[PDB]
Amino acid sequence: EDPETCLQLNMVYQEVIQEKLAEANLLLAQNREQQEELMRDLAGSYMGHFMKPYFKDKVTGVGPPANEDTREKAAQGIKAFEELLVTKWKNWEKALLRKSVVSDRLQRLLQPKLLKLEYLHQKQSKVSSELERQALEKQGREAEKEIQDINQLPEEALLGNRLDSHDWEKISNINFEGSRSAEEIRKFWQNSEHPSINKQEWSREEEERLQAIAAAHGHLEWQKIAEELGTSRSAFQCLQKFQQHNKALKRKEWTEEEDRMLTQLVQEMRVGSHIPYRRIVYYMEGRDSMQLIYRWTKSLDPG
Amino acid sequence: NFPEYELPELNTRAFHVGAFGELWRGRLRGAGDLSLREPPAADSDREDAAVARDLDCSLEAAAELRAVCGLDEVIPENTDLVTLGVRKRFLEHREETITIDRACRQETFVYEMESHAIGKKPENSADMIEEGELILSVNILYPVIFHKHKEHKPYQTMLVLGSQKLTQLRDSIRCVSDLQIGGEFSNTPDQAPEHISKDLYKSAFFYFEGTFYNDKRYPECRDLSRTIIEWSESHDRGYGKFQTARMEDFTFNDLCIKLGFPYLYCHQGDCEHVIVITDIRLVHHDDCLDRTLYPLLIKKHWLWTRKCFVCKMYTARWVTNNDSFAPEDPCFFCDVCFRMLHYDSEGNKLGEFLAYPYVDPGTFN
Amino acid sequence: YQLYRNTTLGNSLQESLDELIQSQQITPQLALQVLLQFDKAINAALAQRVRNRVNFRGSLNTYRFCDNVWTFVLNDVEFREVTELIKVDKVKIVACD
Amino acid sequence: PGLQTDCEALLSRFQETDSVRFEDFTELWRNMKFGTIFCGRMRNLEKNMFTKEALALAWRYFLPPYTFQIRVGALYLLYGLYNTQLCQPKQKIRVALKDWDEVLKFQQDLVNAQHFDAAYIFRKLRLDRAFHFTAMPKLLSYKDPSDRVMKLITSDVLEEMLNVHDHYQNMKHVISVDKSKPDKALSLIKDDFFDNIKNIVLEHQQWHKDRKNPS
Amino acid sequence: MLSRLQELRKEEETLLRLKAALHDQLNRLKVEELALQSMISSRRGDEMLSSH
Amino acid sequence: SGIVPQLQNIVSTVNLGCKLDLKTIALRARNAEYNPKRFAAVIMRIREPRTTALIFSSGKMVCTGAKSEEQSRLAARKYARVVQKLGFPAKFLDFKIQNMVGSCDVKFPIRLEGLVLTHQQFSSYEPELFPGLIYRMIKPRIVLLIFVSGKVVLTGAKVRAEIYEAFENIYPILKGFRK
Amino acid sequence: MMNAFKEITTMADRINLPRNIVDRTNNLFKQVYEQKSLKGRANDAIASACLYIACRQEGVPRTFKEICAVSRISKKEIGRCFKLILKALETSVDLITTGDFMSRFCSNLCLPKQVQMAATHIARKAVELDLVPGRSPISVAAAAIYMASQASAEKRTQKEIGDIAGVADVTIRQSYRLIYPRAPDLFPTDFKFDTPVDKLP
Amino acid sequence: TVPKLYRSVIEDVINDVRDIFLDDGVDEQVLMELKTLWENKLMENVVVCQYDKIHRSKNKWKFHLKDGIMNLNGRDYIFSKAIGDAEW
DNA sequence: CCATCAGTGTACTAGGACCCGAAAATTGAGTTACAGAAGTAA
DNA sequence: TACTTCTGTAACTCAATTTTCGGGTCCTAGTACACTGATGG
Ligand SMILES: [Zn+2]
Ligand SMILES: [Zn+2]
């Protein structure tokens, strides 16, 4: 009758189809947002990058300079966690130490004579004489004989006497890749791993002699105890053997005051059914975790 | 703001904790869900009426729903499912391979730490937590004490309370670095112990998404973040726009952070811990409701305890360097062995060494 | 090598040897032999006695390369050793390999 | 360790009934003895860990993009699992903020659809305070999905479209000044819109079936 | 995780096909509306020949 | 189109007019490098024009890196003055711009395969050796590196007008091969 | 002029390529020796370039890395002499397509013929869909081979495919991530497999 | 650390030249007084080093130094490896 | 009957190679000058 | 004995390729520590 009805129906149809199009476009936008999330999942990426140097450069890899508080703490000699970190000495490490010390001594004993031979050769090059040249040749032959003698030196005489200064810092870098400090290597070589330290198993007679010497001489001069023991032993080894065979190390008898202390400590440091006895021990004097476990399980248990 | 995955399953976009808590409390406002009360024929009628009003159903329909939807151990287990079958096979294997069949020390320790304070009512009724307090299940990564800490990172998790002033978690984080005793006691070990590091160096600061909250509460405290800010202000380090705060005028409720993202907590000069907020949740009625002790250690790693190198019965009360007797340069001794090995008769040090007081990380942390 | 005979150690060795020469207690040939031995010893020690990494940032003012020696001059430089900072206005780096 | 398989099997056996009543879920629970899933010797630590895993899996299945039947089945699964626990401090279902809108609208739809069983189950879960209203579904450190085609096009949408189209044809027939033929300026309407959308949807479902059919 | 990726991308292709069909429908509707405007203008032009 | 290439490098040569002792220049210059075991020229760098000059014992200097002809000439004169202050009779004779390297972006991906197919006699496209198509334009002796990203690099020209005309000639072809 | 045909024959034998290609290579070598537009280049490099040109021309193109592995020179000189010969001879070679290296790459590997056809179709559709713009056809072939092997019963890691096609595993990953989301639509419609194409690394 | 390295270097040099001192005809007392004089006298910023790799970007210089002794602010330091960056 | 003293069941260490991916850096071609050494080729 | 190529340096472009750099990754092997299980005077 009049296309105005065509217009009304037509833009209402366009409105409904446009609502449908808008809903579909919102679904498409959500899908593309999901896809972006998924690609950033593919492009996503640890805890280790923060641990000690939380702030660190991406070009040099070093964190901020130490705080003045850190400097003051270091001045007071408060050992850091890495300074108190202790690692066991492996057997291959011991063999590497031995070989490195031997090579170090060989190099240190060879460098002087080698340099002397080089100087003799240099003088021979410009001597402007013959008889003096023959004398220099004889001196060079003597130097070469000395070098050969040094080269064929036995290991026993080459190792030293556990008190001579070797290049322990070089061993920490060339021989060892930096896993051991110079002082650690020096102490381990001098006190423990030197061949002049008797590492053989103790004998009953040796143990009895050690006990008698500790009793008579006192348990406070273990250096003199090791020296007087006769056998080549370190004071640390003698003290260790005495302690492992001692009987006064632990009190060996419970008292009412000690029982009260143990009960108080347990009640203070309990978290339920978990009773950490190792942590309890160190407020007790001369006690072991096994003793506390037995005491609290058999006698002091309220049940 | 709404917490959403910034990374697929690893991180969330930075959002204000206050807005998140306000949203949660407004969506549960007056719904009878945030109660914090202990669980409790006449009540049946009231329950039926409530069901009818909430579900737009008749009273008889509500009664039918209540009666029909009711709830619907014993060691034997038969007619097993796949998972129940796996459990049965595992139990049989454990029985045939184990002789004691008890909870290991680590398992009991972890369970007791997790459940140490659950449902513990306050003794005063004045420290009761409000209905909805935005508990943060924070975790503090242990420092590198032993070498293997670099490979696998142990952490201690603490249920910090929302709307709780900072410096209440800093004073609660138990680290051995605060108990360090400075100085060298080689000459005589009977010196009066110097004030623990907790007293000498009170400074510390949190760092949460480019904002250094410094612990300037005490006069002995001074800005540790100043060094970091100056270091960043230098030529160029990517980091920039560092902010600063006081750490006592801010609360965990006013913090804008991410979940699962490593933030920093520095104290005692350079002792750094990684703070990670695992999740944030409203306070329930089956967990601790106290405020005096809510900065609660939910889990700790139970570190190893160093032993005297002479005798393996006691821990290390002293650490000696440059020792003329020890095999290792850093050597650990207890009081007894240290005294017997390092002093002749009255405290005169024998040989040469540098002895320091050592506090066992596995005992005080 | 004629590189490490410019620092405090090498300089002081140079004046000590000169003081012996003017004192008629040592000959110049031994002086130069000792100098070469010191060069070898310091090279070996530094290459094998030292393990510590430094990182320096600056604005390179000038540089120069000739006969296998680099001569950098940097301004407003900061060195970072293991843990400490060393800030200087100007520094000269003489490298040779 | 096989828990997901049990959950999937229970949900499949619930959906194959094409029912929403809690009676069918209770019958399946009693027949499968699913209440004994927690039975078995296991100390408190691993017990609560397994309960946490079960509740998290059930809640994940309760949320989209799963079908309505699967979602309601997972709701009953959550109810049964939480109500039947061996842990004294009953583990709570972790609910995120972003998912609260979906759960609330799902409950509103359930009550609207006269599915009073599921609505009452959810109300009982809420009243018992079995929900830990966390920030994210899981702690952060360091199937029968639903398609968008049904939301786009379905029976009612196409019925309305064809009704509009035929009404449009009628008003075209009546608009023209002459009843014999319509005007030549309006003849661009497409009759293949329904055919085109039917082709698209049939191709989509053909792809879906040849996908879920193994090679 | 490619299962959901492929499901989502296939749904994406299907819904792009639906948008293409609906956009063609909208374009033809707008062309029809332009024709409507033109012919209504022409037809209404037949009765302003007698006005005040 | 309305886009024109922007010059990135300008290589020019000059004759100083006197033999030079490269060792003296290396030892007395401020930023010179002299490695006779690697090359037979002194490499000097300056900041104001940001250019690098290779100075040869024969007295011929090659300046590169300048972004404009005037900048290149100023840099060459600066190097000549620097050499003059070192006690050499250096002059400024026979200054010539030897190469002009410019870059541009047509801002649409290009189908290299079709371009090489229809321009086999000019283009050389070897993905194994270089990911870019090498078009040897013939009217001006210019070489164009054309990439799928739309970036076009023109090289080998002695004058800026040569680069501009080469880009004008190449643009219609790229538009016809708009990916 | 001699000692080059023998060297060409040795190179061809090391590849087990047919004699017609060898005759074409000899003809190209004789030609380039007649123009002498590249006299300064070594005879071995010219022979390698001629062999590459002949292989490309006959329709069984090889890669520069597959001629370097046979010749005594590096890929740089092979490419330089290839360009020089194409310039001097005033001839041209059709651009290599990703389907040319499919048969040889999948025959060197123990992949079945079905996997070969699947990889060829994947690569052709990927290049048609512009999923790998401006990337060498060899990398696209390697990525297609990898996806076809991972989806098929016989699986191959990136290392073996890189060795066979002479493409670094990093390049394989880069060319694989671009076509990663579009894995299914690239596969043949009628393709049987035991490991679903719906899940892949 | 620097004083320890200097002392070690002095000891090594003395031990190496003791043979020449003995041979050429100068008593070891001259050697001892040389050591004492060197040690006693041991008590512009210049870095003498060796270059492992001097990389030059467009304007960024990256220095990799094998070893060196530096004289910063009148204080001597030693490094066995330097990774430095600069902008010309 | 209160102490003993190997075994015990774990997580927690200790070394010990070993891998995974990202970022930076390099190579490679295109031009053109320039001087001198290498590198065959004849 | 000629007669070539091949070094740098510059400068943008892009892909390919290598390098290397911090951290993880997995696996075997002791290690700590509460508890048990007799065990003996
Ligand atoms: Zn701490
Ligand atoms: Zn002890």
Author numbering:
A (entry chain c): 81 to 125, 141 to 398
B (entry chain b): 28 to 67, 76 to 107, 119 to 411
C (entry chain V): 3 to 99
D (entry chain a): 5 to 146, 162 to 234
E (entry chain d): 1 to 52
F (entry chain O): 159 to 337
G (entry chain M): 114 to 314
H (entry chain U): 9 to 51, 332 to 376
Copy out sentences from the published article reporting this entry, exactly as the authors wrote them.
Transcription initiation of snRNA genes relies on a specific factor called snRNA-activating protein complex (SNAPc). SNAPc binds a DNA motif in the upstream region of snRNA promoters, referred to as the proximal sequence element (PSE). The core of SNAPc binds two turns of DNA and recognizes the snRNA promoter-specific proximal sequence element (PSE), located upstream of the TATA box-binding protein TBP. Two extensions of SNAPc, called wing-1 and wing-2, bind TFIIA and TFIIB, respectively, explaining how SNAPc directs Pol II to snRNA promoters.
To obtain a high-resolution structure of SNAPc, we additionally reconstituted a SNAPc-containing Pol II PIC on DNA that was based on the U5 promoter sequence. The resulting cryo-EM dataset enabled refinement of the SNAPc-containing PIC in the CC state at an overall resolution of 3.0 Å and with the local map of the upstream region extending to 3.2 Å. The local map enabled building of an atomic model for SNAPc and PSE-containing upstream DNA. The high-resolution structure of the SNAPc-core bound to the U5 promoter shows how the subunits SNAPC1, SNAPC3 and SNAPC4 fold and interact. The SNAPc-core is stabilized by intricate interactions of SNAPC3 with both SNAPC1 and SNAPC4. SNAPc also contains two protrusions that we refer to as ‘wing-1’ and ‘wing-2. Whereas wing-1 of SNAPc binds to TFIIA, wing-2 binds TFIIB. SNAPc interaction with TFIIA and TFIIB involves three interfaces that we call A, B and C. In interface A, the wing-1 of SNAPC4 (helices α4 and α5) slides under the four-helix bundle of TFIIA like a wedge, stabilizing the flexible bundle region. Interface C is formed between wing-2 and the C-terminal cyclin fold of the TFIIB core. Although biochemical studies had identified SNAPC3 and SNAPC4 as poor DNA binders when investigated in isolation, our results suggest that formation of the SNAPc complex with its intricate interactions between these two subunits enables tight binding of the PSE, which explains how SNAPc recognizes the snRNA promoter.
